[PDB]
Amino acid sequence: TYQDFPSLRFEPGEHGVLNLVLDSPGLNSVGPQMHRDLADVWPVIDRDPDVRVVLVRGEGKAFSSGGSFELIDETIGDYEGRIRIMREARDLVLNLVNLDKPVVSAIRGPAVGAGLVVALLADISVASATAKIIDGHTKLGVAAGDHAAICWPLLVGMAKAKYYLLTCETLSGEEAERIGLVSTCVDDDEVLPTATRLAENLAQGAQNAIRWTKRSLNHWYRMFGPTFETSLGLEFLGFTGPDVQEGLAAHRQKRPARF
């Protein structure tokens, strides 16, 4: 069923729960192959009669450190690759928003940028109190164009959304729950157990009621689709600008950027 997504791990759980695991170098960074697979996996899951609920997590004590340096290098260096990556970033968000089956995220450690999209667009997000949530874009040197403009104002309100998206100050899981960015917060060691119970309970519930409830609520995000697409275009116009070269170098060299 999932042969077309070789960078992703697909592990059956109980009662139609599918465990989807992000397992890659650099605390589950999202590189070119994973970026494509994450974009295009959701429609396949929605048509799979043996899956009722997706439970998504990173391998180990990390959800994702964000786009890999290889992903960013490809985007900066090649026009065709940049547009392909853009199409994938667009479709990750829209395919998730258009997925009728529910998604529960189990967020431990870092959850950044391209991986954070999945963590936060999950229907129910379970965050470690000590998770480290960072959108990351403005610190890298590009606009926050990969999901935040479709949802953050309707998660945390505009004042908190602007504070964290503009500054890229780290948000703990506990603080994320406090302001509404995530559904619930528990101790790190209880994140997977808690997310698993929630996923199993949805999987044994009334399926169309559940799916139709989340589909209806998702119209709120769909109404900000054009807003999201504008943000994405502006992010991608940034990848040929000078700031991102410094932002990326600063990341690679473990130092502060000097824009």
Add this chain to the structure above:
Amino acid sequence: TYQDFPSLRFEPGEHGVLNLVLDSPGLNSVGPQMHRDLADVWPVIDRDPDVRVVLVRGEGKAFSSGGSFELIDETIGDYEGRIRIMREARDLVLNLVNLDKPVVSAIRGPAVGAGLVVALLADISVASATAKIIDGHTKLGVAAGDHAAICWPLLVGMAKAKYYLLTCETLSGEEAERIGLVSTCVDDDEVLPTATRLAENLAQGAQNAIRWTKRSLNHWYRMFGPTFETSLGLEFLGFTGPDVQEGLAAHRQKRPARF
């Protein structure tokens, strides 16, 4: 003025406050007459020159347990009745959203389903810290189509909205106020006193200023009217499916549903 709404209690307060009380068996369950009366009372109130403010509450330590089993039976069992009940559900929400006079809710004990609609669409909602707020639909086996999709994302943010609407985990009044679902939280024995003070202050205030302020704010909900109507359609298509028959049987038999 209101002999045409026999299931509701109408009690004048001071300064143009109208007390509207839901008083029925099963902790103020909503049967066929009450469901009809709650839909259609609002336009009559808005045209009544002796009413300035509505203060809505249940009798005793309960707002409402929601639709009665017999109301649900009609929704499942009769084509014309189902459409009638759907139109009433539609118009409860839209007549409230289109009401220029302010409504204050005094929420004690359970507030569920069809009765929760009024509690939460009230302009100012006063919740007991120990109220029990439950949308209830997905546990019954139908989509949450009777109000939540017009408002919950804009009350609590999407992550909290999805958590409670999909799982139907009970929300206390205290937690509801923390996440923004209700306006204010006080101890159970202070709910009606607090609500009465707030209602009387509105009734003695500048009427057009108050009404025009809430009307303008209500544009936000009106923009999600189509979203709401889609949710309502999916809920009511659910009354034609197998899950609700199990969910209703389970509620009657005081046992877990086995979907």
Add this chain to the structure above:
Amino acid sequence: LTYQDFPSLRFEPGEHGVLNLVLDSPGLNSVGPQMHRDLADVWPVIDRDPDVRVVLVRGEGKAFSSGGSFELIDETIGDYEGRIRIMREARDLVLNLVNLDKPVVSAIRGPAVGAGLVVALLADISVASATAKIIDGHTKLGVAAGDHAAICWPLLVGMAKAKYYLLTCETLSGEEAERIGLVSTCVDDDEVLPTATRLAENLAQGAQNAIRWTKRSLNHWYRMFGPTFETSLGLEFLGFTGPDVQEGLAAHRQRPARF
């Protein structure tokens, strides 16, 4: 010479392209006719000024603004041509700020009321003193809350909290404002300006197009409620020639109002 057309405002260069914009007038920085016009019209000039990267806006001393001056309110009520002029200024204060690409950081101490509050809360990052006093006062004065709240409060604090404060006119401390999402962050009064200064300087040293394009994209959410804002403003201004505002004002200028 750049800002000579705005005589009521103080323009003081900070570090790294930060412009300090200071509201300094008698009566805890009350806003008179010149200042109301200058606050409306300054923003496009700032956006085109290549030497400004970030605006840090504050009142002089322990106040952001106490409200509109006697003279401003008197022209609003007493003269048709002047009233429409003031309405245009009120409209464009909100819309020019929502259309501003450069970031604005507000440092809110003491009272924040009227056009000053508009600026304080539409700032991209709002830093509130724990003991700031935030008041939307309109309905208490006898007019609709038409000067900004309808473009933003539901998407800051959710509808239940927005209706509560806008309909009751209860004072919101800076501490409570931060608890409910109205402002970005809260610190002790003596830390407000240092905190706001750090935040402003950090934005000014960051990746400029990334920051500006992020906030621009987020501001589409407020732009979508433009018509709702303009409805609220029209209703406020229809109120200015009604009997209620005479009593609400007469009362303020002289106890409970007797509407």
Add this chain to the structure above:
Amino acid sequence: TYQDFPSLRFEPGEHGVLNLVLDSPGLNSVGPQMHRDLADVWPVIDRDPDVRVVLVRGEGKAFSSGGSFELIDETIGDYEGRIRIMREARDLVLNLVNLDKPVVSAIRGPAVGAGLVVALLADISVASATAKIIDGHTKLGVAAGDHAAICWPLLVGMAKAKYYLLTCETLSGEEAERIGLVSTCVDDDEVLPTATRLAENLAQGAQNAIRWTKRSLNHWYRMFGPTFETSLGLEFLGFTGPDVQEGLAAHRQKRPARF
């Protein structure tokens, strides 16, 4: 039921068609009672199970010449009256957009201002080739705030809408059909027969299919409700300005207005 609307003539037709006739002095001028009755009749029709379709027309060879001197002068000269009339103007539009039963208009001769609203918001509008369709507002000296901003762009497109609304050039029934403002155009003596056949065919069709089709389509107008309401406020702020006094004078005295 219908006794509460004394200015309106209600005449049953065949198959559940209700004829609603506007019959008053000055080619069916709308006076204060008629303006109120037209606003408030629609919800009563929707609840009457003996009515399936409304066929609305003027008496004789005129739909309506628009507001009577009394109605216009009240709006200029009295605060309370102006607000009442504004409420009615608002609710004529919104109650029609929210009506599930179909309305067919039979438009002969003049259709102006306040009675034009019903003619054009009818689901099916049958225009005499020689009807004279005049929004009229800018020529009276006030904004076109009584319906056109909820619908004209989605009838004729924006360039045609602005042309006729800004200039107030008369639109013939024939030209109205050419550009899409009305559904069909026939000779004057065929208008009532054609409208009657269409109304009777709707009345004999599949009722919920028809009602739900038009309800769904009406969501498009509802999404421009806030745009409509801001137009309405601007119109009503104009009734306090100097131009309308000259506009009313010029209308009554068959001279070109000299603004």
Add this chain to the structure above:
Amino acid sequence: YQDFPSLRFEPGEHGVLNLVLDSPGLNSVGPQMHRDLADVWPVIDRDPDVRVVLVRGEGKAFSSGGSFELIDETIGDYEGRIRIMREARDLVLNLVNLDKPVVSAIRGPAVGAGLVVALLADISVASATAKIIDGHTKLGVAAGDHAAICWPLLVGMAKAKYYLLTCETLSGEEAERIGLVSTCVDDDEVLPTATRLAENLAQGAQNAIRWTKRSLNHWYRMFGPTFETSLGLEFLGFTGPDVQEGLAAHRQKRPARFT
């Protein structure tokens, strides 16, 4: 394309894919074709050998609409009805979300379920003597399978309501006059014209074309919730009495007697 057995795929020149609806009985859409039409579009969008789709019926018919087999299942079986509904939803949404351009070549009848594809095509080439009929209200269900996402933005609301409510046949010539289709030619020039247009797109600047149509399609996406409301209402109609009579009347080639 092996997964879409009911569709004919004929490669053309320059990356034009001809997609032909070919079934016995004027290309009625049966169960298999209804599923295939829903799900084919995302596969086309990912196929690097296809640049443009030219969609047509076999012979002098685009499609007579849903087959009797298809309507019977929809009426007769809950699980089937929900499946068919999902397909009806996804036909529209997958077409609206397709980046590659679609040219329709419309000859003879274009009805209901096959009319969806004809009119949601980016460029629609209609025979002057095509017969365009939405068909739903005459069958006895709401027009819920596409028209509410687009007709008001094609022909304006007055023409949209006229044809959707009455189901009067619209010729291709009149359809072009009112803006429902892009262009009109004689029957024998339809396929040549459509082919020339498709090849010109296929030889054009690809991303420019795709991004132009994608951007324009945001207008339809904004009415997604309106479309989904219409679809639910249609599907609630399929278990009502009217459709049984409409279907019977079509079989027997007599007028329906609904009321």
Add this chain to the structure above:
Amino acid sequence: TYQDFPSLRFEPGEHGVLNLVLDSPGLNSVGPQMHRDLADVWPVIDRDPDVRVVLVRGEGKAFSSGGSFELIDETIGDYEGRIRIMREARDLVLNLVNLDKPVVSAIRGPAVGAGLVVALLADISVASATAKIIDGHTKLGVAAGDHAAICWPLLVGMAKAKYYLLTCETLSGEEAERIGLVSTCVDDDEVLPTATRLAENLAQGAQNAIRWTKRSLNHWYRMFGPTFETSLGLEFLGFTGPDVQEGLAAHRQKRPARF
């Protein structure tokens, strides 16, 4: 007043009509100065108390041939220039949509791309029967991002919008009026006389009524602001692609493009 706009001619007409004339080489091509001047002139006009209405036209037998080859070369060749030009393109559309004073366009000869923006976003557009209206972007090799996505669907409906925007087939002024793209069409020799009459009539009319009518109608375009900005970003991502290089070379060498 207008010292800041050197590429534009500003000539007083009668009664507060300002004649704004585009006069430059190559049939009024838009170079870098004129591109910035056209973007930024509108807010200055709105504040100029001596101007009531703008009448915009080209010098001689052309409105504008659109962007000059130097303007397009800078967009392709320089990152900082490209971003500047994008800002100007954005602000031309938004500043025009946000202008309260009415604009009448007198369209003779070609009106293409960047010059076509002003011609079609004018409130009243008067087209020569033999004007040549060409959006032109897809033929150049970039998306139609400079205005069409904010308005064409609401002018001509989606079928006609897609036809002309995807193909870049020329549209005559006569055909443009038939489909609703422009307000009115007269023969070439009558364009300036007709536009002058209309502009003078507006300038002698009820000023606030006129301005508030067009402002309210412009909310329809504002609601598609995000859609417009998306299209603009996609156009500008096009300028670093291979197609536009070929499209520009094709134009220069007066030949067909070979993408």
